[PDB]
Amino acid sequence: SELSFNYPNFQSVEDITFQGGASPRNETLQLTPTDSNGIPIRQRAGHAVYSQPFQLRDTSFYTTFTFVIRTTSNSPADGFAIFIAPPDFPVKRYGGYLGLFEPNTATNTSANKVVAVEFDTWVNTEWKEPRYRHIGIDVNSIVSVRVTRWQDKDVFSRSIATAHVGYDGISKILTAFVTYPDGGNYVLSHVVDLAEIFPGDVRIGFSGATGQYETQYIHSWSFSSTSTN
Amino acid sequence: SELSFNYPNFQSVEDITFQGGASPRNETLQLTPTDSNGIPIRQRAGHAVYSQPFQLRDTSFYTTFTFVIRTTSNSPADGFAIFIAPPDFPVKRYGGYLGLFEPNTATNTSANKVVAVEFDTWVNTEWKEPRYRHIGIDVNSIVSVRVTRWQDKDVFSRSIATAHVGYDGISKILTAFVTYPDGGNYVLSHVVDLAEIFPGDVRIGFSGATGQYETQYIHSWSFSSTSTN
Numbered sequence: 116s117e118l119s120f121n122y123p124n125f126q127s128v129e130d131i132t133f134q135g136g137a138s139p140r141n142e143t144l145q146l147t148p149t150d151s152n153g154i155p156i157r158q159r160a161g162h163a164v165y166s167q168p169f170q171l172r173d174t175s176f177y178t179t180f181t182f183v184i185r186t187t188s189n190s191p192a193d194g195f196a197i198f199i200a201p202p203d204f205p206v207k208r209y210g211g212y213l214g215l216f217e218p219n220t221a222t223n224t225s226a227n228k229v230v231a232v233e234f235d236t237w238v239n240t241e242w243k244e245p246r247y248r249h250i251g252i253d254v255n256s257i258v259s260v261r262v263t264r265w266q267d268k269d270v271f272s273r274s275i276a277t278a279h280v281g282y283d284g285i286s287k288i289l290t291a292f293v294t295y296p297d298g299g300n301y302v303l304s305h306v307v308d309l310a311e312i313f314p315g316d317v318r319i320g321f322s323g324a325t326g327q328y329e330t331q332y333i334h335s336w337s338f339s340s341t342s343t344n
Numbered sequence: 345s346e347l348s349f350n351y352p353n354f355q356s357v358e359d360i361t362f363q364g365g366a367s368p369r370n371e372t373l374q375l376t377p378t379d380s381n382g383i384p385i386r387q388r389a390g391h392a393v394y395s396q397p398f399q400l401r402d403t404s405f406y407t408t409f410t411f412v413i414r415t416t417s418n419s420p421a422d423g424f425a426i427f428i429a430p431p432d433f434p435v436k437r438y439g440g441y442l443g444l445f446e447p448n449t450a451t452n453t454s455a456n457k458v459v460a461v462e463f464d465t466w467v468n469t470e471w472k473e474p475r476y477r478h479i480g481i482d483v484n485s486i487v488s489v490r491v492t493r494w495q496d497k498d499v500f501s502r503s504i505a506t507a508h509v510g511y512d513g514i515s516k517i518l519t520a521f522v523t524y525p526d527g528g529n530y531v532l533s534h535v536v537d538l539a540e541i542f543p544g545d546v547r548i549g550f551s552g553a554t555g556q557y558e559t560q561y562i563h564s565w566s567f568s569s570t571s572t573n
């Protein structure tokens with residue numbers, strides 16, 4: 116279906132739903148909470164989602180957002196993701212599950228209905244993933260289907276970074292481009308039929324989780340979808 | 345192989361190779377020439393290409409540029425493309441061939457070695473293309489393999505638009521995202537093994553052609569390529 120929205124900053128959160136530990140702070144979406152001294156709270160997850168559902172049948176889409184990861188140590192955890200899921204999709208487990216999965220079913224593709232691009236600051240040995248920080252595409256599992264190294268220089272830059280995520284509904288390809296100013300650029304593409312996974316309604320949004328020594332902030336976000344008929 | 349470059353504008357055109365009717369103008373790359381009255385010169389093609397060749401084996405890349413199409417009537421032609429080809433690729437035919445193909449072989453995939461994302465302002469009936477203006481991915485042929493409608497409101501906007509083109513060397517997928525400020529967004533992705541098409545060196549750059557009543561300008565451009573080992 117056709118849907119467009121645009122938040123050049125989050126001085127407005129008019130259409131945004133906040134769940135779990137996520138909140139509007141400093142004209143951004145703050146995905147996980149901080150205490151009254153500004154310290155990241157461990158073992159929390161939160162979602163900030165566009166409130167209105169849409170459909171993916173015969174649809175392409177483009178979305179872009181800017182974000183900052185603020186770390187207070189060289190061992191931050193756990194990262195955040197942009198995700199698509201059904202509209203009743205709740206905030207799930209904190210830690211390495213990134214608020215997107217339940218421990219009992221995290222790697223079971225038949226038990227999950229969620230597609231995400233993840234920015235993973237913490238190397239987990241509880242399931243298969245790279246030995247370094249990484250950006251990944253996730254289809255129904257915490258074990259990414261396509262993954263690439265995320266350079267520490269970019270991770271710790273404190274820069275406002277940009278992501279572009281698009282879906283070509285004809286070729287059934289999900290793509291992410293991630294860029295840092297005067298820094299690294301990242302490209303991941305993966306063939307996945309989103310309409311098959313999601314034959315009804317979906318909502319798009321962000322999920323972050325701790326972990327430790329890390330807060331994740333979205334600073335802007337826009338989106339457009341169009342019919343491929 | 346690994347190559348990066350960055351032109352925040354074209355105050356300098358050092359390491360750009362120009363051919364045909366393309367030249368440096370007012371801190372831009374002007375793809376096709378204008379006459380002493382400022383009027384687009386009909387039936388001209390030009391290339392502006394980065395000078396340093398690179399290799400595609402086990403390589404991913406990201407490129408972005410901004411551009412303007414200047415039309416002087418409601419019947420502009422022909423458009424421009426970003427393209428990859430061997431480094432001795434010459435300027436080819438003007439008009440709907442976009443500077444990229446010769447008439448006798450333009451639709452014969454075995455007779456060409458060029459891949460492009462094209463911005464096509466002129467619907468040609470001399471071969472198969474859509475009945476409206478369109479953005480396309482071309483693989484060895486002027487008949488695009490993937491095409492999407494390009495809205496006339498964007499075409500004629502006179503805005504500074506942005507393109508992002510990426511290649512995922514693991515999945516072998518070329519993707520374009522094109523964006524207009526308060527305008528349309530476009531997404532195309534296609535599977536193509538660029539290292540198989542181009543076993544040796546290649547350059548990346550632009551090709552524009554007239555046509556009539558149109559000049560194409562590139563205002564900024566950056567590129568990075570990284571190994572997939």
Ligand SMILES: CC(=O)N[C@@H]1[C@@H](O)[C@@H](O)[C@@H](CO)O[C@@H]1O
Nearest residue numbers: 192193209210211212241325326
């Ligand atoms: C499985 C799991 O969530 N593991 C988490 C890991 O993701 C990270 O948050 C870590 C920081 O001390 O704490 C746990 O080990």
Ligand SMILES: CC(=O)N[C@@H]1[C@@H](O)[C@@H](O)[C@@H](CO)O[C@H]1O
Nearest residue numbers: 421422439440441466470554555
């Ligand atoms: C095959 C070919 O190039 N056809 C051109 C067309 O692309 C456009 O330039 C037009 C402008 O009037 O003239 C036609 O002759």
Ligand SMILES: [Ca+2]
Nearest residue numbers: 235244251259
């Ligand atoms: Ca991961």
Ligand SMILES: [Ca+2]
Nearest residue numbers: 211235237239
């Ligand atoms: Ca992890």
Ligand SMILES: [Ca+2]
Nearest residue numbers: 464473480488
């Ligand atoms: Ca065309």
Ligand SMILES: [Ca+2]
Nearest residue numbers: 440464466468
């Ligand atoms: Ca044409």
